[PDB]
């Protein structure tokens, strides 16, 4: 029932600002502090600061003073972080989290919002099937030529999870990303069970379902 | 309306410390106050809905590096309210050229942490007919000899029924409060024109802090409520006295700063609060400062007395 | 500030073993210390707070202890799902920084990959490019070699690989290799093959198709 719902992944230009949001629900928003945490790709966690939603009282890590501004809108139970004067070092996933009652841990975390700082244009993916050629077959989707990261891929709207592998994206020589998601299934299911990969690229608002069939 | 009050001094070995348990039993409730001078002077306040709640003390755990759980009121399910009040620092300001009502009141000296005081043994002071005891102390390290003939005293008194003492400031009590009198006596100021004060911290409810709710100052009343009544509260008059007999002419203003949300790490560490509550970061701190830059002061006789009430339930209606 | 040293930065252990991660601080933090686990692609999850309090729902094989400047996370009877990154965080003097992290890797038996090959889709071929995909599924350890052959000619410089982190059920890796040709180049040749070398195989395994 406690949920922190963060805004969609973003592409932002060098030197611009961006405001990320985190909507809290399932509890009284003014009774707990909210923190923001930064994670660069492949790197560890960095504490940005905290805000008390009732008063807007804040503490900041000195490293982010003037980069980050925390605010809250109490009526909509929404926490915001404004990131200003963006550069490449700001490309990261930003998590909102709710403190525990005692204010000595972060208990509930949002899913994170990825920000990529670049002058390049956003581009949604093309999705192509990887069609199935002891009694297990592999099939998948090729999610190609998108920018920036990330994309998310699910199979049969989340109903298929076992045997799924979604690979890390690779940056192609074009400057666009590509990835594959694959699943192993019973070879005997292939004429009777439909397999659909569901792709979401939030920076371009591109959402695609691709049915994957024996050729 | 009335309560049966028991008071016990609870001692242990090794490393004896002052711990005072006041238990004020009503018809269907008990109020517990646990006062201590282990760390900065502190009180843990617990209200229960049983006449049979008890305090457990594990002395070896209380004195260890991780004292969480060493103090308990049982059964835990009976607890209706719990909090703490800590007196963290004795403040001192040079008020030469400051104006009355300034914040800060003067140029601050380095505060005395009350966690670094040593205390007399409270056993001797316990007066069961008056329901009182006192904690009297001085800094352990005093290279200047400022407390060579000085001390800071916290006098605690409980009450079985409602009443109004004759002695100023004549705060109306009920059976739901203790009275605390704090007195600084005979310590040397570090310069002329010193205003003294106290930093007080409470354990807050959620992230934010309550405000002080507010006739000459001798008939005025300030009140701080932890939450909507019934709940913890403190009440005091905005006056202190600069002479032991508390003549009206010796009265000084007592100004309270605004309450600030404060982390544990910005206060002297309290093993008592950590024993009862575990690690917590929601404190609310404020400074009380006594006196104006001119007029009566601590400087007259090196004497300052201030009184307050601390309670649980509905505040005394002092009118 | 408080300086925190989390150690070790990485550890490798087998299922069923007990391991420990230590966080040392520069000053007494009075048990204001939490531990998190973070799995690949997920938010961190709180395991223990106040040095030693286990969060409800977290398995009892996780325990924390410590006081003053020395704090320890212990994982008893390590399971495959324990793979991932762990972080301490203090809540004493701000800033409330994190330890540098500990990557926990799971040792397991050698397992050879299952290999699959995928021709480009007709949909893709319409747009002038061809991607050929080779999947190496569920293998251990991670070292593996994939070579592409097109009409029996070894390819170089026109492929890219990607590899998963260890699987949370069986501790294996999976790998994709993608060969990228222009459509013209794809339609000039017949036989597309990927050849896979790995410790767990007696000799290289080759999967191929003929365009069509
Ligand atoms: C804090 C302290 O010194 N307390 C002591 C206590 O340990 C001792 O049992 C008692 C004997 O009268 O005197 C008091
Ligand atoms: C009996 C009951 O339910 N509640 C009473 C309350 O009315 C009263 O204030 C007190 C007696 O002083 O004891 C409690
Ligand atoms: C006097 C007393 O009750 N001691 C107990 C003891 O069994 C234990 O060592 C510790 C709990 O951590 O403190 C408690
Ligand atoms: C006699 C009485 O009222 N006991 C109550 C109990 O019912 C309740 O569970 C608890 C917590 O509020 O407070 C006490
Ligand atoms: C200015 C200063 O530093 N000290 C003076 C001291 O000369 C004087 O005798 C005393 C008066 O009570 O205090 C003041
Ligand atoms: C709780 C509060 O406001 N405490 C202040 C403290 O921060 C300051 O260092 C001191 C000297 O000005 O006065 C007091
Ligand atoms: Na966003
Ligand atoms: Na002094
Ligand atoms: Na204390
Ligand atoms: Na005086």
mmCIF file of N, CA and C in Angstrom, chain B residues 129-203:
data_model
loop_
_atom_site.group_PDB
_atom_site.id
_atom_site.type_symbol
_atom_site.label_atom_id
_atom_site.label_comp_id
_atom_site.label_asym_id
_atom_site.label_seq_id
_atom_site.Cartn_x
_atom_site.Cartn_y
_atom_site.Cartn_z
ATOM 1 N N UNK B 129 8.380 13.007 51.567
ATOM 2 C CA UNK B 129 7.251 13.816 52.024
ATOM 3 C C UNK B 129 6.922 14.972 51.058
ATOM 4 N N UNK B 130 7.941 15.540 50.412
ATOM 5 C CA UNK B 130 7.735 16.556 49.411
ATOM 6 C C UNK B 130 7.739 16.047 47.972
ATOM 7 N N UNK B 131 7.914 14.744 47.790
ATOM 8 C CA UNK B 131 7.954 14.112 46.470
ATOM 9 C C UNK B 131 9.024 14.746 45.575
ATOM 10 N N UNK B 132 10.220 14.973 46.110
ATOM 11 C CA UNK B 132 11.240 15.716 45.340
ATOM 12 C C UNK B 132 12.629 15.071 45.404
ATOM 13 N N UNK B 133 13.461 15.406 44.416
ATOM 14 C CA UNK B 133 14.871 15.054 44.446
ATOM 15 C C UNK B 133 15.608 16.037 43.608
ATOM 16 N N UNK B 134 16.920 16.027 43.715
ATOM 17 C CA UNK B 134 17.641 16.897 42.834
ATOM 18 C C UNK B 134 18.958 16.390 42.371
ATOM 19 N N UNK B 135 19.330 16.882 41.200
ATOM 20 C CA UNK B 135 20.526 16.482 40.457
ATOM 21 C C UNK B 135 21.398 17.736 40.456
ATOM 22 N N UNK B 136 22.542 17.689 41.098
ATOM 23 C CA UNK B 136 23.418 18.855 41.169
ATOM 24 C C UNK B 136 24.779 18.520 40.597
ATOM 25 N N UNK B 137 25.273 19.363 39.703
ATOM 26 C CA UNK B 137 26.450 19.031 38.945
ATOM 27 C C UNK B 137 27.347 20.143 38.529
ATOM 28 N N UNK B 138 28.503 19.742 38.003
ATOM 29 C CA UNK B 138 29.471 20.656 37.427
ATOM 30 C C UNK B 138 30.295 19.961 36.351
ATOM 31 N N UNK B 139 30.956 20.723 35.483
ATOM 32 C CA UNK B 139 31.730 20.094 34.425
ATOM 33 C C UNK B 139 32.814 19.251 35.004
ATOM 34 N N UNK B 140 33.106 18.124 34.342
ATOM 35 C CA UNK B 140 34.208 17.217 34.739
ATOM 36 C C UNK B 140 35.547 17.909 34.444
ATOM 37 N N UNK B 141 35.671 18.507 33.257
ATOM 38 C CA UNK B 141 36.861 19.322 32.874
ATOM 39 C C UNK B 141 36.587 20.824 32.955
ATOM 40 N N UNK B 142 37.198 21.468 33.944
ATOM 41 C CA UNK B 142 36.994 22.891 34.229
ATOM 42 C C UNK B 142 38.367 23.562 34.415
ATOM 43 N N UNK B 143 39.163 23.631 33.334
ATOM 44 C CA UNK B 143 40.531 24.164 33.486
ATOM 45 C C UNK B 143 40.564 25.589 33.993
ATOM 46 N N UNK B 144 39.523 26.373 33.716
ATOM 47 C CA UNK B 144 39.472 27.762 34.236
ATOM 48 C C UNK B 144 38.955 27.949 35.682
ATOM 49 N N UNK B 145 38.437 26.879 36.277
ATOM 50 C CA UNK B 145 37.837 26.943 37.597
ATOM 51 C C UNK B 145 36.527 27.740 37.649
ATOM 52 N N UNK B 146 35.798 27.797 36.548
ATOM 53 C CA UNK B 146 34.504 28.519 36.494
ATOM 54 C C UNK B 146 33.463 27.967 37.477
ATOM 55 N N UNK B 147 33.522 26.666 37.769
ATOM 56 C CA UNK B 147 32.596 25.992 38.689
ATOM 57 C C UNK B 147 33.285 25.570 39.967
ATOM 58 N N UNK B 148 34.439 26.189 40.291
ATOM 59 C CA UNK B 148 35.144 25.827 41.532
ATOM 60 C C UNK B 148 34.235 26.011 42.743
ATOM 61 N N UNK B 149 33.401 27.027 42.721
ATOM 62 C CA UNK B 149 32.426 27.183 43.793
ATOM 63 C C UNK B 149 31.026 27.346 43.177
ATOM 64 N N UNK B 150 30.721 26.582 42.130
ATOM 65 C CA UNK B 150 29.468 26.747 41.406
ATOM 66 C C UNK B 150 28.846 25.404 41.067
ATOM 67 N N UNK B 151 27.545 25.405 40.768
ATOM 68 C CA UNK B 151 26.882 24.191 40.311
ATOM 69 C C UNK B 151 25.624 24.541 39.547
ATOM 70 N N UNK B 152 25.179 23.580 38.748
ATOM 71 C CA UNK B 152 23.883 23.633 38.052
ATOM 72 C C UNK B 152 23.005 22.533 38.666
ATOM 73 N N UNK B 153 21.796 22.881 39.110
ATOM 74 C CA UNK B 153 20.950 21.948 39.843
ATOM 75 C C UNK B 153 19.638 21.804 39.099
ATOM 76 N N UNK B 154 19.175 20.555 38.961
ATOM 77 C CA UNK B 154 17.852 20.254 38.387
ATOM 78 C C UNK B 154 17.042 19.638 39.520
ATOM 79 N N UNK B 155 16.048 20.374 40.040
ATOM 80 C CA UNK B 155 15.231 19.870 41.151
ATOM 81 C C UNK B 155 13.899 19.386 40.605
ATOM 82 N N UNK B 156 13.540 18.158 40.910
ATOM 83 C CA UNK B 156 12.319 17.515 40.319
ATOM 84 C C UNK B 156 11.343 17.350 41.472
ATOM 85 N N UNK B 157 10.076 17.685 41.233
ATOM 86 C CA UNK B 157 9.037 17.500 42.221
ATOM 87 C C UNK B 157 7.783 16.967 41.526
ATOM 88 N N UNK B 158 7.183 15.914 42.110
ATOM 89 C CA UNK B 158 5.902 15.382 41.687
ATOM 90 C C UNK B 158 4.756 15.828 42.602
ATOM 91 N N UNK B 159 3.535 15.542 42.161
ATOM 92 C CA UNK B 159 2.352 16.036 42.826
ATOM 93 C C UNK B 159 1.255 14.966 42.810
ATOM 94 N N UNK B 160 0.573 14.851 43.939
ATOM 95 C CA UNK B 160 -0.520 13.868 44.099
ATOM 96 C C UNK B 160 -1.894 14.452 43.739
ATOM 97 N N UNK B 161 -1.994 15.779 43.714
ATOM 98 C CA UNK B 161 -3.257 16.484 43.494
ATOM 99 C C UNK B 161 -3.036 17.909 43.025
ATOM 100 N N UNK B 162 -4.112 18.611 42.700
ATOM 101 C CA UNK B 162 -3.986 19.956 42.141
ATOM 102 C C UNK B 162 -3.642 20.990 43.211
ATOM 103 N N UNK B 163 -2.942 22.043 42.804
ATOM 104 C CA UNK B 163 -2.539 23.064 43.792
ATOM 105 C C UNK B 163 -1.636 24.105 43.157
ATOM 106 N N UNK B 164 -1.426 25.199 43.860
ATOM 107 C CA UNK B 164 -0.644 26.304 43.351
ATOM 108 C C UNK B 164 0.322 26.692 44.451
ATOM 109 N N UNK B 165 1.608 26.441 44.239
ATOM 110 C CA UNK B 165 2.561 26.839 45.272
ATOM 111 C C UNK B 165 2.560 28.342 45.551
ATOM 112 N N UNK B 166 2.886 28.683 46.790
ATOM 113 C CA UNK B 166 3.022 30.078 47.209
ATOM 114 C C UNK B 166 4.284 30.705 46.602
ATOM 115 N N UNK B 167 5.327 29.945 46.456
ATOM 116 C CA UNK B 167 6.610 30.481 45.959
ATOM 117 C C UNK B 167 6.507 30.865 44.468
ATOM 118 N N UNK B 168 6.998 32.054 44.092
ATOM 119 C CA UNK B 168 7.051 32.440 42.672
ATOM 120 C C UNK B 168 7.867 31.413 41.874
ATOM 121 N N UNK B 169 7.463 31.054 40.671
ATOM 122 C CA UNK B 169 6.468 31.708 39.845
ATOM 123 C C UNK B 169 5.020 31.186 40.035
ATOM 124 N N UNK B 170 4.721 30.411 41.089
ATOM 125 C CA UNK B 170 3.359 29.987 41.366
ATOM 126 C C UNK B 170 2.634 29.350 40.177
ATOM 127 N N UNK B 171 3.263 28.353 39.548
ATOM 128 C CA UNK B 171 2.608 27.625 38.471
ATOM 129 C C UNK B 171 1.559 26.691 39.119
ATOM 130 N N UNK B 172 0.365 26.712 38.583
ATOM 131 C CA UNK B 172 -0.662 25.706 38.951
ATOM 132 C C UNK B 172 -0.293 24.319 38.480
ATOM 133 N N UNK B 173 -0.152 23.385 39.409
ATOM 134 C CA UNK B 173 0.035 21.974 39.056
ATOM 135 C C UNK B 173 -1.255 21.132 39.213
ATOM 136 N N UNK B 174 -1.232 19.969 38.563
ATOM 137 C CA UNK B 174 -2.195 18.892 38.741
ATOM 138 C C UNK B 174 -1.406 17.619 39.013
ATOM 139 N N UNK B 175 -2.117 16.518 39.240
ATOM 140 C CA UNK B 175 -1.463 15.239 39.496
ATOM 141 C C UNK B 175 -0.845 14.707 38.214
ATOM 142 N N UNK B 176 -1.087 15.368 37.082
ATOM 143 C CA UNK B 176 -0.552 14.895 35.819
ATOM 144 C C UNK B 176 0.801 15.546 35.397
ATOM 145 N N UNK B 177 1.487 16.239 36.319
ATOM 146 C CA UNK B 177 2.713 16.912 35.980
ATOM 147 C C UNK B 177 3.764 16.732 37.075
ATOM 148 N N UNK B 178 5.020 16.847 36.666
ATOM 149 C CA UNK B 178 6.157 17.140 37.540
ATOM 150 C C UNK B 178 6.555 18.622 37.337
ATOM 151 N N UNK B 179 7.161 19.227 38.348
ATOM 152 C CA UNK B 179 7.732 20.527 38.202
ATOM 153 C C UNK B 179 9.255 20.350 38.213
ATOM 154 N N UNK B 180 9.936 21.121 37.368
ATOM 155 C CA UNK B 180 11.405 21.112 37.324
ATOM 156 C C UNK B 180 11.837 22.520 37.625
ATOM 157 N N UNK B 181 12.783 22.673 38.529
ATOM 158 C CA UNK B 181 13.425 23.958 38.743
ATOM 159 C C UNK B 181 14.889 23.797 38.384
ATOM 160 N N UNK B 182 15.405 24.703 37.567
ATOM 161 C CA UNK B 182 16.816 24.655 37.201
ATOM 162 C C UNK B 182 17.466 25.879 37.833
ATOM 163 N N UNK B 183 18.593 25.694 38.525
ATOM 164 C CA UNK B 183 19.286 26.783 39.146
ATOM 165 C C UNK B 183 20.782 26.738 38.856
ATOM 166 N N UNK B 184 21.322 27.836 38.319
ATOM 167 C CA UNK B 184 22.763 28.025 38.169
ATOM 168 C C UNK B 184 23.203 28.916 39.319
ATOM 169 N N UNK B 185 24.170 28.445 40.096
ATOM 170 C CA UNK B 185 24.559 29.129 41.310
ATOM 171 C C UNK B 185 26.092 29.152 41.441
ATOM 172 N N UNK B 186 26.662 30.359 41.483
ATOM 173 C CA UNK B 186 28.082 30.567 41.835
ATOM 174 C C UNK B 186 29.130 30.235 40.803
ATOM 175 N N UNK B 187 28.749 29.827 39.603
ATOM 176 C CA UNK B 187 29.709 29.697 38.521
ATOM 177 C C UNK B 187 30.139 31.064 37.945
ATOM 178 N N UNK B 188 31.413 31.156 37.571
ATOM 179 C CA UNK B 188 31.922 32.377 36.998
ATOM 180 C C UNK B 188 31.561 32.556 35.565
ATOM 181 N N UNK B 189 30.994 33.728 35.230
ATOM 182 C CA UNK B 189 30.812 33.993 33.809
ATOM 183 C C UNK B 189 32.177 34.154 33.102
ATOM 184 N N UNK B 190 32.193 34.050 31.793
ATOM 185 C CA UNK B 190 33.439 34.209 31.058
ATOM 186 C C UNK B 190 33.667 35.631 30.610
ATOM 187 N N UNK B 191 32.770 36.545 30.913
ATOM 188 C CA UNK B 191 33.031 37.971 30.680
ATOM 189 C C UNK B 191 31.935 38.727 31.374
ATOM 190 N N UNK B 192 31.922 40.057 31.272
ATOM 191 C CA UNK B 192 30.849 40.839 31.837
ATOM 192 C C UNK B 192 29.701 40.805 30.862
ATOM 193 N N UNK B 193 28.534 41.182 31.340
ATOM 194 C CA UNK B 193 27.354 41.236 30.500
ATOM 195 C C UNK B 193 26.953 39.852 29.908
ATOM 196 N N UNK B 194 27.233 38.764 30.628
ATOM 197 C CA UNK B 194 26.814 37.418 30.152
ATOM 198 C C UNK B 194 25.351 37.160 30.393
ATOM 199 N N UNK B 195 24.651 36.688 29.363
ATOM 200 C CA UNK B 195 23.332 36.101 29.512
ATOM 201 C C UNK B 195 23.447 34.590 29.433
ATOM 202 N N UNK B 196 22.895 33.889 30.408
ATOM 203 C CA UNK B 196 22.930 32.427 30.332
ATOM 204 C C UNK B 196 21.658 31.885 29.697
ATOM 205 N N UNK B 197 21.724 30.625 29.274
ATOM 206 C CA UNK B 197 20.565 29.958 28.708
ATOM 207 C C UNK B 197 20.706 28.449 28.728
ATOM 208 N N UNK B 198 19.658 27.773 28.263
ATOM 209 C CA UNK B 198 19.607 26.316 28.204
ATOM 210 C C UNK B 198 19.139 25.904 26.844
ATOM 211 N N UNK B 199 19.773 24.901 26.287
ATOM 212 C CA UNK B 199 19.225 24.240 25.088
ATOM 213 C C UNK B 199 18.418 23.037 25.546
ATOM 214 N N UNK B 200 17.198 22.963 25.079
ATOM 215 C CA UNK B 200 16.243 21.951 25.436
ATOM 216 C C UNK B 200 15.877 21.217 24.148
ATOM 217 N N UNK B 201 15.841 19.897 24.209
ATOM 218 C CA UNK B 201 15.394 19.084 23.065
ATOM 219 C C UNK B 201 14.280 18.151 23.489
ATOM 220 N N UNK B 202 13.258 18.037 22.637
ATOM 221 C CA UNK B 202 12.210 17.095 22.856
ATOM 222 C C UNK B 202 12.257 16.052 21.738
ATOM 223 N N UNK B 203 11.634 14.933 21.974
ATOM 224 C CA UNK B 203 11.495 13.932 20.914
ATOM 225 C C UNK B 203 10.194 14.261 20.176
#
